[PDB]
A paper describes a structure:
d-Alanylation of the teichoic acids of the Gram-positive bacterial cell wall plays crucial roles in bacterial physiology and virulence. Hence, the d-alanylation pathway has emerged as a promising antibacterial target against drug-resistant S. aureus. d-Alanylation of teichoic acids is mediated via the action of four proteins encoded by the dlt operon, DltABCD, all four of which are essential for the process. Here, the crystal structure of DltA from the methicillin-resistant S. aureus strain Mu50 is presented, which reveals the unique molecular details of the catalytic center and the role of the P-loop.
DltA from S. aureus (SaDltA) was crystallized in the presence of ATP and Mg2+. The monoclinic crystal, belonging to space group P21, contains four DltA molecules (chains A, B, C and D) in the asymmetric unit. Subsequent d-Ala adenylate formation and breakage of the ATP phosphodiester bond result in a 140° rotation of the C-terminal subdomain towards the ‘thiolation conformation’, in which the Ppant group of DltC can approach the active site of DltA for loading of d-Ala to complete the reaction. The SaDltA structure features the canonical adenylation conformation, allowing it to grasp the ATP substrate and Mg2+ ion in the active site that lies between the N- and C-terminal lobes and posing it for the d-alanine adenylation reaction with the Ppant substrate channel blocked by the loop (Ppant blocking loop; residues 463–476) in the C-terminal lobe. The P-loop of DltA has an amino-acid composition similar to that of the P-loop or Walker A motif found in other adenylate-forming enzymes; thus, the loop has been suggested to bind ATP or pyrophosphate, despite the lack of direct structural data to support this assumption. In chains A and B of SaDltA we observed clear electron density allowing us to unambiguously assign the residues of the P-loop, whereas the electron density of the corresponding residues in chains C and D was very weak and we could not model four residues (residues 148–151), indicating significant flexibility of the region.
Residue numbers in the entry: 2 to 147, 152 to 485
The structure:
């Protein structure tokens, strides 16, 4: 089981099945393989990764498959990344080639920028031997910035095989992707979908910002398998039609990247009693995710906050005696690109074993891992210590809060109090009373000093470009 081989076998079985769909733009398995070989011909000899630029054109997938076959790999760059960071990336990468999959012109200080047109009308042969090997760097994905992470081809093959076993909805399914391709969550949709003959359906930024457009896309395609961040799922729960009775095609979900709120999982389990729902956790540095747990009624009833589950093959998890989880194994990245200090500082791979220090406080209780917080988001107030996420979880377990993020406030380089930005369960008609009620509701769940002074009621929490809660942008609304 090899990525190119399963895709090619499926393309040979069903050349006219759709491999990729972005609104009306469709790409069949035959064209995905045809155009990917043509790109590989233009790409061969290249021992530098191909920059992959665009948003949601199906030719981004062409780019990925082409970069795999030529063996040089790719660096996915989404149009939502600021231009100066794009310049920084192309500069670090030293590409020979840049695939501009958008309609507008792109130009790059390094390498040859070509368009889809160069491939649509290329005359190069449509058969090309894949020359990737296990230890090649298949992709380099850059960190959010909350450095380019390098991933071995074998890590990807392994990760996809894991997703294929976790998948209970079979082959030839309609898959949904939300993550931009510069966010490795999309990998969790791209390759398990193509490796099982599915159709990768692309949600773009516009759909994320204008939910009526998302609703339209959902009505045009009956989605079966859904891969997204928890925050995106939370937003889509406000589509009332999105339930098992009215949208019965949808029966499997994979979430990664953020804490999955117990309330959100509860609602989804309620509205799709038959769906296979997985919570997964992992950093970019260990190939997308390393744990999974199926969320059921029992998992909900029995776990006040959800675990992230058990480790996968290629990922041996251990916990340092301060609680920092460490991942060892094939899932571990080779390291950040031409950034030796940043690599030494969290990566230890000596004697051929590979280890990554995660920065998340994790705890293992009765067969299951829990992610409690990012080490940085730990506060001492009144000489006491909780993880910011824990405070936020306590706020979410309150009938007046539908969603909540907590902002520490500082001076003289030390936290002074907390402000809670709240999406309330009800529009907050009155200002004094809700502050009163949230604080009183907290008497049970929090020691006084960890209850925020202020609340800032927000209609909606802003999301990052990757679909996570935008902490920085939430800070700015509070800070003046
Ligand atoms: N299911 C989950 N539950 C709780 N936390 C999660 C889950 N999945 C991922 N995380 C968090 O997301 C982190 C991985 O995020 P990602 O690799 O996409 O970028 P980042 O670490 O958020 O930002 P940066 O690019 O600055 O590192 C993990 O370190 C963990 O903190
Ligand atoms: Mg990280």
């Amino acid at each position: 089981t090899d990525i190119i081989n399963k895709l090619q076998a499926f393309a040979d079985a069903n050349p006219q099945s759709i491999a990729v769909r972005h609104t009306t733009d469709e790409l069949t398995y035959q064209q995905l393989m045809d155009e990917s070989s043509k790109l590989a011909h233009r790409l061969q000899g290249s021992k530098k990764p191909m920059i992959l630029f665009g948003h949601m054109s199906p030719y981004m997938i062409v780019g990925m498959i082409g970069a795999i076959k030529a063996g040089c790999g790719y660096v996915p760059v989404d149009t939502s990344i600021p231009e100066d960071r794009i310049k920084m990336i192309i500069n670090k990468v030293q590409p020979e080639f840049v695939f501009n999959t958008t309609d507008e012109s792109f130009e790059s200080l390094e390498g040859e920028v070509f368009t889809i047109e160069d491939i649509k009308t290329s005359q190069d042969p449509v058969i090309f031997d894949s020359q990737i090997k296990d230890n090649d760097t298949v992709y380099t994905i850059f960190t959010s910035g909350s450095k380019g992470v390098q991933i071995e081809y074998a890590s990807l093959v392994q990760f996809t095989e894991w997703m294929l076993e976790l998948n209970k909805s079979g082959n030839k399914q309609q898959w949904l992707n939300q993550a931009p391709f510069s966010f490795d969550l999309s990998v969790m949709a791209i390759y398990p979908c193509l490796a099982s003959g599915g159709t990768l359906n692309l949600v773009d930024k516009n759909m994320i910002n204008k939910p009526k457009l998302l609703n339209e896309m959902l009505t045009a395609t009956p989605i079966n398998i859904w891969v997204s961040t928890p925050s995106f799922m939370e937003m889509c729960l406000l589509l009332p039609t999105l339930n098992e009775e009215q949208y019965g095609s949808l029966n499997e979900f994979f979430f990664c990247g953020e804490i999955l709120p117990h309330r959100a999982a509860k609602a989804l389990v309620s509205r799709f009693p038959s769906a296979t729902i997985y919570n997964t956790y992992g950093p970019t540095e260990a190939t997308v995710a390393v744990t999974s747990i199926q969320i059921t009624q029992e998992i909900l009833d029995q776990y006040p906050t959800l675990p992230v589950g058990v480790e996968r093959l290629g990922a041996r998890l251990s916990t340092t005696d301060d609680g920092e989880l460490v991942i060892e194994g094939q899932s571990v990245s080779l390291g950040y690109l031409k950034n030796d200090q940043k690599t030494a500082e969290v990566f230890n791979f000596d004697d051929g074993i590979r280890t990554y220090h995660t920065g998340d406080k994790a705890k293992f209780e009765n067969g299951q891992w829990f992610i409690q917080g990012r080490i940085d988001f730990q506060i001492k107030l009144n000489g006491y210590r909780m993880e910011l996420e824990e405070i936020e979880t306590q706020l979410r377990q309150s009938e007046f809060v539908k969603e909540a993020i907590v902002v520490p406030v500082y001076k003289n380089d030390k936290v002074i109090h907390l402000i809670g930005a709240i999406v309330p369960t009800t529009e907050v008609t009155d200002n004094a009373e809700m502050t009163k009620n949230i604080k009183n509701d907290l008497k049970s769940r929090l020691p006084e000093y960890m209850i925020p002074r202020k609340f800032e009621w927000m209609e909606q929490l802003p999301l990052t470009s990757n679909g996570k809660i935008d902490r920085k942008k939430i800070a700015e609304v509070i800070n003046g």
